[PDB]
Write a protein that holds these residues in place. Structure first.
Motif, PDB file in Angstrom:
ATOM      1  N   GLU A 128      21.624  51.279  86.904  1.00  0.00           N
ATOM      2  CA  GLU A 128      20.366  51.508  87.627  1.00  0.00           C
ATOM      3  C   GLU A 128      19.079  51.487  86.780  1.00  0.00           C
ATOM      4  O   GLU A 128      18.150  52.265  87.012  1.00  0.00           O
ATOM      5  CB  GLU A 128      20.459  52.750  88.513  1.00  0.00           C
ATOM      6  N   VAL A 129      19.045  50.593  85.814  1.00  0.00           N
ATOM      7  CA  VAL A 129      17.874  50.408  84.978  1.00  0.00           C
ATOM      8  C   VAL A 129      17.264  49.037  85.287  1.00  0.00           C
ATOM      9  O   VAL A 129      17.968  48.035  85.304  1.00  0.00           O
ATOM     10  CB  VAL A 129      18.244  50.436  83.477  1.00  0.00           C
ATOM     11  N   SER A 130      15.979  49.013  85.585  1.00  0.00           N
ATOM     12  CA  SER A 130      15.272  47.744  85.844  1.00  0.00           C
ATOM     13  C   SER A 130      14.319  47.468  84.676  1.00  0.00           C
ATOM     14  O   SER A 130      14.030  48.361  83.884  1.00  0.00           O
ATOM     15  CB  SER A 130      14.471  47.832  87.147  1.00  0.00           C
ATOM     16  N   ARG A 131      13.857  46.218  84.558  1.00  0.00           N
ATOM     17  CA  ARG A 131      12.926  45.847  83.496  1.00  0.00           C
ATOM     18  C   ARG A 131      11.665  46.713  83.571  1.00  0.00           C
ATOM     19  O   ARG A 131      11.190  47.220  82.554  1.00  0.00           O
ATOM     20  CB  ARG A 131      12.544  44.338  83.586  1.00  0.00           C
ATOM     21  N   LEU A 132      11.160  46.912  84.795  1.00  0.00           N
ATOM     22  CA  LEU A 132       9.966  47.712  85.024  1.00  0.00           C
ATOM     23  C   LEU A 132      10.152  49.195  84.591  1.00  0.00           C
ATOM     24  O   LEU A 132       9.210  49.828  84.126  1.00  0.00           O
ATOM     25  CB  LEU A 132       9.528  47.618  86.491  1.00  0.00           C
ATOM     26  N   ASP A 133      11.370  49.726  84.747  1.00  0.00           N
ATOM     27  CA  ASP A 133      11.673  51.106  84.314  1.00  0.00           C
ATOM     28  C   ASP A 133      11.410  51.258  82.815  1.00  0.00           C
ATOM     29  O   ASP A 133      10.821  52.234  82.380  1.00  0.00           O
ATOM     30  CB  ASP A 133      13.134  51.459  84.593  1.00  0.00           C
ATOM     31  N   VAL A 134      11.851  50.264  82.035  1.00  0.00           N
ATOM     32  CA  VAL A 134      11.671  50.291  80.599  1.00  0.00           C
ATOM     33  C   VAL A 134      10.191  50.079  80.217  1.00  0.00           C
ATOM     34  O   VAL A 134       9.645  50.822  79.383  1.00  0.00           O
ATOM     35  CB  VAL A 134      12.599  49.265  79.892  1.00  0.00           C
ATOM     36  N   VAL A 135       9.529  49.111  80.879  1.00  0.00           N
ATOM     37  CA  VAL A 135       8.122  48.838  80.623  1.00  0.00           C
ATOM     38  C   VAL A 135       7.257  50.101  80.940  1.00  0.00           C
ATOM     39  O   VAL A 135       6.348  50.452  80.175  1.00  0.00           O
ATOM     40  CB  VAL A 135       7.606  47.603  81.441  1.00  0.00           C
ATOM     41  N   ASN A 136       7.582  50.789  82.046  1.00  0.00           N
ATOM     42  CA  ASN A 136       6.867  52.027  82.427  1.00  0.00           C
ATOM     43  C   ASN A 136       7.060  53.127  81.385  1.00  0.00           C
ATOM     44  O   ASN A 136       6.166  53.920  81.151  1.00  0.00           O
ATOM     45  CB  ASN A 136       7.319  52.535  83.808  1.00  0.00           C
ATOM     46  N   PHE A 137       8.247  53.166  80.766  1.00  0.00           N
ATOM     47  CA  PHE A 137       8.515  54.154  79.734  1.00  0.00           C
ATOM     48  C   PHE A 137       7.722  53.844  78.495  1.00  0.00           C
ATOM     49  O   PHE A 137       7.168  54.733  77.874  1.00  0.00           O
ATOM     50  CB  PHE A 137       9.997  54.220  79.376  1.00  0.00           C
ATOM     51  N   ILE A 138       7.687  52.572  78.124  1.00  0.00           N
ATOM     52  CA  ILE A 138       6.928  52.141  76.960  1.00  0.00           C
ATOM     53  C   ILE A 138       5.437  52.451  77.144  1.00  0.00           C
ATOM     54  O   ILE A 138       4.793  52.942  76.240  1.00  0.00           O
ATOM     55  CB  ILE A 138       7.127  50.625  76.722  1.00  0.00           C
ATOM     56  N   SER A 139       4.928  52.230  78.358  1.00  0.00           N
ATOM     57  CA  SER A 139       3.499  52.448  78.652  1.00  0.00           C
ATOM     58  C   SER A 139       3.107  53.881  78.946  1.00  0.00           C
ATOM     59  O   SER A 139       2.021  54.301  78.592  1.00  0.00           O
ATOM     60  CB  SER A 139       3.052  51.577  79.856  1.00  0.00           C
ATOM     61  N   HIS A 140       3.986  54.630  79.625  1.00  0.00           N
ATOM     62  CA  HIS A 140       3.615  55.982  80.086  1.00  0.00           C
ATOM     63  C   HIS A 140       4.489  57.160  79.664  1.00  0.00           C
ATOM     64  O   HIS A 140       4.153  58.299  79.944  1.00  0.00           O
ATOM     65  CB  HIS A 140       3.442  55.976  81.596  1.00  0.00           C
TER      66      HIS A 140
END
Ligand SMILES: [Y+2]
Lengths: 142, 94
Positions: A128-140
């Protein structure tokens, strides 16, 4: 510019694949290495990923599907898959397209999602990990 | 060695067949070379597969993950290119 921790992850993963006489260094060898890469590990923990289970699934797949070089061949050695090369180039492209140069394990994790026919991307989405989940973590963070 | 910075329901990726296609230019010896070098076959089995390509028009060399199959296909085609043979290697969903 791959950071120190990413290079250490990449080089050790390549060395272990060579010690196992694997014909290929895959995106799955890559994801497996990233589980202990602090930058990528933190992102996965923020996504509540069972790292023990993902590690086991990756190791089993690698052992079952990676061809082993015969002891007789001494001219060809472990080489990256095209898919692996694309992921690293994609990570560098993504970072440079934001105006920066430092590539981390988390950026490589993001790049893995674009290899849609890779087992690594399938396993990340299974957890249940999406590309956006990781990008959101990197950003926020969070 | 490598230079790392200059090289609903979910279904798992499919396995892929790696295929060698026949042509009138590629020598039988080179097809066998390719089967031993890139698919680890011994002389005997490589000769049988070479004959299958010759008579049937194409033959399955192996079945691999999508990721491994893609790489093997590129490696075979590059080796054929370097040796100036139009030997075509392809892949297909298993
Ligand atoms: Y370099």
């Amino acid at each position: 510019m791959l950071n120190q921790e990413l290079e250490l992850s990449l080089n050790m993963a390549f060395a272990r694949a060579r010690e196992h006489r694997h014909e290929f260094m895959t995106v799955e060898h890559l994801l497996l290495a990233l589980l202990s890469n602090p930058s990528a590990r933190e992102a996965l923990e923020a996504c509540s990923v069972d790292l023990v289970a993902l590690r086991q699934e990756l190791e089993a797949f690698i052992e079952q599907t990676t061809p082993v070089l015969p002891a007789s061949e001494e001219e060809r050695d472990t080489q990256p898959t095209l898919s692996f090369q694309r992921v690293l180039q994609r990570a560098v492209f993504h970072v440079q397209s934001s105006g920066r140069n430092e590539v981390t394990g988390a950026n490589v994790l993001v790049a893995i999602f674009s290899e849609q026919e890779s087992q690594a991307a399938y396993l990340l989405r299974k957890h249940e990990v999406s590309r956006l989940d990781v990008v959101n973590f990197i950003s926020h963070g969070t | 060695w490598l230079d790392f910075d200059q090289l609903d329901a979910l279904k798992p990726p499919s396995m892929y067949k790696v295929i060698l296609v026949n042509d009138d230019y590629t020598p039988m010896e080179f097809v066998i070379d390719v089967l031993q070098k890139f698919f680890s076959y011994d002389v005997e089995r490589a000769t049988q597969l070479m004959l299958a390509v010759h008579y049937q028009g194409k033959a399955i060399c192996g079945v691999f993950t999508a990721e491994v199959a893609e790489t093997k296909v590129a490696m075979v085609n590059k080796y054929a290119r370097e040796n100036e043979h139009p030997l075509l290697c392809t892949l297909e969903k298993a």
